[PDB]
Design a protein around this nucleic acid. Structure first.
Ligand SMILES: [Mg+2]
Ligand SMILES: [Mg+2]
Ligand code: NA
Lengths: 138, 142, 153, 221
RNA sequence: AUCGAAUCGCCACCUACAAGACUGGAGCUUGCUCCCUCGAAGGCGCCAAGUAUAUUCAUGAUCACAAGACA
RNA sequence: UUAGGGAUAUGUGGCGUCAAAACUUAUGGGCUCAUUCUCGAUACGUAAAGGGUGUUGGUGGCCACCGGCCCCGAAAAUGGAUGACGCU
């Protein structure tokens, strides 16, 4: 209401600025859980199949053999985590399951992964997997 | 030579003192530091930022959580950092470690400045590494 | 217009172990295959190439079919088609691609700062010229609102 | 679906921003129907969110009469004792594409149902999609690389309007108005585009020299 | 108000349109030659608002969902 | 050809989606267009004579004959099947 003066000042200041993204970096690659190893007869759930962005070749997929892999999700209640006492800021409904890359699959860059002591749940099919850069050989 | 001797190591040649490394995990993930030495008995590496540039103090780190690039800085600092410096009894920094930090960092900064390409190396140490959409780290040289 | 397949025509290899190398057509076998050689390159001895794997360039050294290596070397040198090919932007793009493929973390950092410097100076120059001739959305709106503000307020 | 008042109340209480999920918009003009469907179904199973536009411009190999006869053979399938239960034959091009994709998914399973519900299809380009960003194509399913040029081919909207689709003229008029609007705006933005081009061309004198050398070495001159 | 949660690029320079037997512009020798935009990059973003001896980072103690957060 | 479980490699059969595998491989060669059951496409397993300048080659003398794919010849009873979608 007769306060066009505020909108008059904002235009005059307007210079060329950009968003510039200076935030906490991500140190992993994005993959997806395609499914389990299977044939026409049925599936074996002890091995999972993972497809990673920009990895489209068997030679590419060999680079990741041995790297660690994570599936992040959430539950309904807050339960125990690592550093539950030392760092109370970590406490949440967020949880993760860990595994390792074992070998490539096919010629197109898919890889086989094995999880620690148990199978990954089938509710993760079609969802995101983190593939880290460690342990490192470089 | 003897495996029981503390001098015995198996570290890969890329992680040699003076090499500039990228941190892959921990509180300082993504920062770049300088490898000072490896602790005895085939122990971890010790790295420092220096803390003026990127804020990374003297710290132990496993060589499996590091990428050792081919860029190097010539270091001839006193390097009097044993295992006891990082062992503690059963914003707050002790007056001994606080002094050791300065004694090392001044020498490290003098070495970087004395090096050619010193300004570029300082900026390189100040920058932060990240994985962008569309990136393919498996295809790169380091 | 298009560059015909003919004896003496320069080509670039598309895929395979000889990718992004330049040769000269010395003979046509049939609709699918040619014989290619480049004396001034190490891996381009006389060999067979499928016509789906080549890219015809704009230069043709004038030679007859199944010519000798001696007669093709000097014809190349006199034509100076290689010194001409090295000056185009597609040749420079190929060399840039190789240089980028073989690069260290330090060099990638150098390129990043060079591009940031260019962008900063470009946006500065743009702001200065937009001050004179208003072309940004905010400057167009400012000039549209100035006349209204001159009255009343 | 109109959002509920409880959702609006929660959004106000949280005080967040306007959220948009990650969506890929595919321009389907001059794409091969079966190959585009085969690629899209696999991406949907891998978990993407996809919207397709310009479904009336898909292509099928062969003549229009042959393809129309195939459709009429499909149309005559009908549960004799009660046709309100028999196969339902959709006539619009976007519904044709959706059925083709549905046949390449495990529809009876919930996973298949989620994948199918993650796809949206349109005829033409609607105004709620026009401004969302650059559209994409599928290189391995384009006509100019898939068909030999000498053979005849069909256009899906032309085939559909003879078996019963009744909105071809509406879509044509809408697309005409759309293209005129976009062209006028594009021409209006030319001064801005040229100013930015000139600014980049001229900053090479004001930057430091040793940066320009790196640009030249990596081919960004 | 429950609510802690999975997701980890942004743009008022992409977010207009057509062709692929053919496609910057000229010739006449219609497949060669000559001209110059050289015909194989949307723009930014990745730690000093910008390429320059400026500057707090620790004890969160060697991995753990990024203890951060929607540039 | 078979005790209860891991890893590696194979057989028959496969590698557009359903559905693991060439994210539709090759920097291999030929051939083929089929309009109301319909080109064709996993053996065992559920169409003939005769015609065709449709197209591709072969023998002997622009001709006569012999081939390869495709097209007529080819007509039943609820709506429906290369397994489905589709593929040129
Ligand atoms: Mg967390
Ligand atoms: Mg598969
Ligand atoms: Na089958």
């Amino acid at each position: 209401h007769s306060q066009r003066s505020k909108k008059l000042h904002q235009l005059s200041a307007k210079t060329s600025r950009v968003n510039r993204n200076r935030k906490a970096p991500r140190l992993y690659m994005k993959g997806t859980l395609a499914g389990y190893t299977r044939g026409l007869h049925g599936q074996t759930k002890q091995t999972a199949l993972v497809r990673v962005e920009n990895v489209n070749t068997r030679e590419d997929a060999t680079w990741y053999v041995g790297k660690r892999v994570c599936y992040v999700y959430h539950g309904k209640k807050v339960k125990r985590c690592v550093r539950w006492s030392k760092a109370p800021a970590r406490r949440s409904t967020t949880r993760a399951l860990w595994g390792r890359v074992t070998r490539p699959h096919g010629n197109a860059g898919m890889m086989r992964v094995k999880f620690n002591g148990a199978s990954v749940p089938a509710s993760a099919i079609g969802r995101r997997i983190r593939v880290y850069l460690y342990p490192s050989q470089i | 030579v003897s495996r029981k001797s503390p001098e015995y190591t198996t570290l890969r040649k890329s992680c040699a003192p003076g090499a500039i490394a990228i941190i892959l995990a921990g509180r300082f993930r993504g920062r770049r530091a300088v490898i000072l030495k490896q602790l005895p008995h085939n122990g971890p590496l010790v790295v420092s930022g220096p803390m003026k540039y990127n804020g990374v103090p003297i710290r132990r780190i496993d060589s499996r959580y590091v990428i050792a690039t081919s860029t190097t800085v010539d270091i001839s600092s006193v390097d009097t950092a044993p295992i006891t410096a990082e062992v503690f009894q059963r914003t707050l920094v002790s007056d001994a470690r606080a002094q050791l930090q300065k004694k090392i960092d001044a020498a490290l900064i003098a070495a970087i400045k004395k090096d050619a390409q010193g300004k570029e190396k300082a900026g390189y140490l100040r920058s932060v590494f990240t994985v962008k959409p569309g990136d393919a780290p498996h295809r790169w040289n380091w | 217009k298009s560059h015909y397949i003919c004896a003496g025509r320069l080509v670039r290899i598309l895929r395979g172990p000889r990718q992004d190398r330049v040769g000269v057509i010395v003979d046509i076998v049939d609709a699918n295959r040619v014989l290619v050689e480049n004396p001034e390159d190490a891996k381009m001895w006389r060999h067979v190439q499928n016509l789906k794997n080549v890219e015809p360039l704009k230069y043709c050294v004038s030679v007859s079919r199944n010519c000798s290596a001696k007669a093709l070397k000097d014809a190349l040198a006199s034509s100076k088609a290689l010194e001409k090919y090295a000056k185009t932007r597609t040749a420079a793009r190929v060399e840039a691609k190789k240089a980028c493929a073989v690069s260290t973390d330090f060099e990638r950092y150098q390129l990043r700062v060079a591009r940031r410097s260019r962008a900063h100076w470009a946006r500065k120059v743009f702001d200065e010229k937009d001050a004179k001739t208003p072309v940004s959305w905010h400057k167009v709106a400012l000039k549209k609102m100035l006349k209204k503000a001159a009255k009343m307020d | 679906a109109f959002p509920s008042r409880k959702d609006a109340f929660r959004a106000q209480r949280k005080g967040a921003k306007k959220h948009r999920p990650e969506i890929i918009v595919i321009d389907l003009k001059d794409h091969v129907l079966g190959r585009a469907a085969a690629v899209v179904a696999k991406q949907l199973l891998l978990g993407k969110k996809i919207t397709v536009v310009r479904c009336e411009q898909l292509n099928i190999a062969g003549t229009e009469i042959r393809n129309k006869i195939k459709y009429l053979q499909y149309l005559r399938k009908r549960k004799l004792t009660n046709p309100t239960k028999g196969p339902f034959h959709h006539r619009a091009p976007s519904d044709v594409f959706v059925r083709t994709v549905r046949s390449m998914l495990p529809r009876y399973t919930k996973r298949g149902m989620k994948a199918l519900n993650s796809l949206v299809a349109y005829e033409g380009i609607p105004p709620n999609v026009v401004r969302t960003g650059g559209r994409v194509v599928i290189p391995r399913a384009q006509r100019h690389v898939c068909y030999r040029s000498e053979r005849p081919y069909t256009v899906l909207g032309n085939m559909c309007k003879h078996v019963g689709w009744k909105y071809s003229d509406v879509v044509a008029n809408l697309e005409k108005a759309r293209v005129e609007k976009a062209s006028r705006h594009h021409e209006k933005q030319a001064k801005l585009r040229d100013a930015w081009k000139s600014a980049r061309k001229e900053a090479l004198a004001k930057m430091p020299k040793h940066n320009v050398e790196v640009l030249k070495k990596f081919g960004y001159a």
